[PDB]
């Protein structure tokens, strides 16, 4: 039904090695760094509560005046090796980096616009330095790219005339030029994560979205492309008019994750969630008292939740103007890293286990049929309920960290009580199950 020139291309999950790597990585970090870091949510004595990276919009700053922030771009504390070390110690396996946000300032020295790092006091190719430094630590790099661009007067939100259609065609060619540049200048890039593709102008030019995906896949072998890029012949986004996923993975969940009981459909495709530490700040905002700020355990909960349902999780950071990270973000990265060093066998290279969800936490499945119980909510009963699928039995339980044997008691036909450890681990913890299928 509904025939389409620009609808889905993959049927089912890609299983080539590059997609396996994307998937197995599981845990990433996001970097939102751009001129917005300089004002940090404040303009002319007013602190705006909205997302800092959107301050141009909240304070109604004309482009030319916003882009003059370039004269203040001088992050003297920037050190790409230090950033890569922070990422490595956090336990991230990849980093997604804002190459260009809506504002249109480029973190690489683009030859297609003057609004780049090259034309700042700092001069240096930030994106290039990061690529090298993260790659040297064995960390994959993914590129965020905003199609919407507030610095280019050829951009259009909608096509309402011939003059608009011509300006927008130029814009699309400009866009292609930047994308080709990114793909050829940084050939180790593993993914392009598009944003700012929701306007009517883009929805009417589905053909371009398909072309952008194909173009990049020809330039970068095995590259992944997110769903958000893609609009079909009819302007339907992410999933085409026949309900098929466009791009290589679904990129949708930001505020909330799929429901572990009601949204099991997501296990059928690759997907990646991205999350902020405050409620809704991606770029650096100077005042984190303005909204709820997640604790490390709340973030770890979300990371395991995503992997338990077959998805990746990416934790966002908004570096300071000076090129260092704020104390709250250093604390977060360090806490996550300490937990991942202990428990990361239940995260990396893991996936949906096919077990009925229980209240204590989440299951994940390893590559050799290990089933991990990740416990976030400790039962006063001191018993962790495990209901197995038809034909599956539990043969052993072990505490991950110490190897100590944990008692498993059959309670009914398809159900066990797995005891909690003899000593309360004092933090979310992992019990590994050995299971057998009839």
Residues that bind ligand EAT (CB under 6 A): 51, 53, 195, 274, 282
Q: Are 8 and 240 in contact (CB under 8 A)?
A: yes
**Which residue's Cβ lies closest to ligand EAT?**
282
User: Nearer to ligand EAT by C-beta: 274 or 420?
Assistant: 274
Q: Provide the 3-class DSSP secondary structure of residue 245.
A: strand
Beta bridge partners of 406: 397
User: Nearer to ligand EAT by C-beta: 100 or 365?
Assistant: 100
Q: How far apart are CA 192 and CA 145, in angstroms?
A: 7
Q: How far apart are CA 188 and CA 41, in angstroms?
A: 33
Give min distance, CB of 195 to ligand EAT, in A: 5
User: For the chain, how big is the Rg over CA atoms in Å?
Assistant: 23
Q: Are 23 and 90 in contact (CB under 8 A)?
A: no
Where helices occur in 33-190 by DSSP H, the ranges are 55-58, 63-67, 80-90, 126-136, 162-185
Give min distance, CB of 164 to ligand EAT, in A: 21
User: Nearer to ligand EAT by C-beta: 255 or 413?
Assistant: 255
Nearest to 221 by CA among 433, 7, 19, 374: 19
| Residue 303 burial by Cβ neighbours in a 10 Å radius (0-12, 13-18, 19+) | buried
Q: List the structure tokens of 299.
A: 């973030």
User: Nearer to ligand EAT by C-beta: 129 or 195?
Assistant: 195
Q: How far apart are CA 356 and CA 308, in angstroms?
A: 11
User: Nearer to ligand EAT by C-beta: 6 or 33?
Assistant: 33
Give min distance, CB of 150 to ligand EAT, in A: 12
Residue with tokens 């986004």: 237
User: Nearer to ligand EAT by C-beta: 4 or 275?
Assistant: 275
Residue with tokens 């994308």: 179
Q: How far apart are CA 44 and CA 58, in angstroms?
A: 12
Give min distance, CB of 117 to ligand EAT, in A: 19
Give min distance, CB of 274 to ligand EAT, in A: 6
Give min distance, CB of 198 to ligand EAT, in A: 7
Q: How far apart are CA 136 and CA 114, in angstroms?
A: 30
Q: Could you tell me whether strands 94-100 and 140-146 are parallel, antiparallel, or unpaired per DSSP bridges?
A: parallel
Give min distance, CB of 306 to ligand EAT, in A: 16
Give min distance, CB of 55 to ligand EAT, in A: 11
User: Nearer to ligand EAT by C-beta: 33 or 355?
Assistant: 33
User: Nearer to ligand EAT by C-beta: 195 or 240?
Assistant: 195
């Amino acid at each position: 039904e509904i025939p389409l020139k620009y609808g889905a291309t993959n049927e089912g999950k890609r299983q080539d090695p590059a997609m396996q790597k994307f998937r197995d990585n599981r845990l990433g970090a996001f970097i939102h760094w751009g001129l917005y870091a300089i004002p940090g949510g404040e303009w002319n004595g007013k602190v705006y509560g909205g997302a800092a990276e959107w301050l141009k919009s909240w304070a109604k700053v004309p482009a030319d005046e916003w882009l003059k922030l370039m004269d203040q771009w001088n992050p003297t504390k920037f050190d790409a090796k230090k950033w890569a070390k922070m990422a490595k110690e956090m336990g991230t396996k990849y980093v997604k980096i804002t190459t260009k946000h809506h504002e249109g300032f480029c973190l690489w020295p683009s030859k297609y616009t003057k609004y780049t790092v090259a034309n700042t006091p700092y001069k240096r190719d930030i994106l290039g330095e990061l690529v090298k430094a993260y790659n040297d630590e064995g960390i994959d790099v993914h590129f965020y790219f905003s199609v919407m661009d507030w610095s280019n007067p050829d951009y259009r939100y909608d096509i309402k005339s011939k003059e608009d259609s011509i300006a927008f065609s130029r814009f699309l060619e400009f866009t292609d030029n930047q994308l080709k540049e990114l793909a050829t200048r940084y050939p180790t890039v593993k993914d392009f994560w598009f944003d700012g593709t929701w306007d009517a102008s883009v929805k009417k030019n589905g053909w371009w979205t398909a072309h952008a995906e194909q173009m990049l896949k020809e330039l970068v072998p095995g590259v992944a492309i997110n769903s958000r890029l893609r609009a079909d012949d009819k302007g339907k986004r992410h999933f085409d008019s026949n309900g098929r996923l466009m791009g290589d993975y679904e990129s949708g969940y930001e505020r909330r994750l799929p429901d572990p009981v009601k949204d099991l459909k997501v296990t059928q495709w690759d997907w990646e969630a991205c999350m902020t530490i405050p409620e809704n700040q991606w770029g650096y905002h100077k005042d984190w008292s303005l909204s709820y700020v997640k604790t490390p355990i709340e973030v770890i909960d979300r990371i395991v939740h995503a992997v338990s349902m077959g998805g990746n999780m990416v934790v966002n950071f908004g570096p300071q103007a000076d090129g260092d990270f704020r104390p709250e973000e250093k604390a977060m990265a360090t806490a996550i890293g300490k937990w991942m060093n202990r428990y990361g066998k239940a995260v990396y290279a893991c996936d949906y286990a096919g077990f009925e969800k229980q209240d204590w936490g989440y299951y994940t499945r390893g590559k050799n049929d290990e089933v991990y119980m990740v416990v976030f909510n400790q039962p006063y009963s001191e018993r962790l309920i495990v209901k197995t699928p038809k034909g599956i039995t539990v043969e052993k339980a072990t505490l991950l960290t110490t190897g100590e044997d944990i008692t498993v008691v059959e309670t009914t036909r398809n159900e066990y009580n797995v005891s909690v450890p003899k000593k309360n681990p004092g933090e979310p913890y992992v019990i590994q199950l050995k299971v057998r299928a009839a």
